[PDB]
Every structure is written in structure tokens, then in C-alpha cells.
């Protein structure tokens, strides 16, 4: 999950061209999904 956020994220930015903070909000969205995970399953890893 975090490699196909961040490597979207990547693309993203390097296609400078056009309006880009639309589908910057969405990979905003997908990115609060990514650390709602995060925050969901390294509390017990850290714990284990």
C-alpha cells in the first residue's frame, strides 16, 4: 500500500502539467487510508 501511494504520488509529480491538486486530494484521501492502517496494525507489530 504505502509503495503504490507513494509511487502514484511520484508519477504525480513528475506530470507537473495541468491541474494536479484534484488527484492530489485523492491520494490525500488514500494516503489518510494508508496511515488509518498504519496507526491500526504497528501498534500491535511494535507491541509483538
Given at each position: 500500500k504505502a509503495a503504490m501511494v507513494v509511487s502514484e504520488e511520484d508519477h504525480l509529480k513528475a506530470e507537473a502539467?495541468?491541474?494536479?491538486s484534484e488527484a492530489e486530494l485523492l491520494i490525500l484521501d488514500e494516503f489518510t487510508t494508508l496511515a488509518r492502517d498504519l496507526y491500526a496494525f504497528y501498534p500491535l507489530l511494535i507491541r509483538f
Open positions: 502539467r495541468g491541474d494536479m
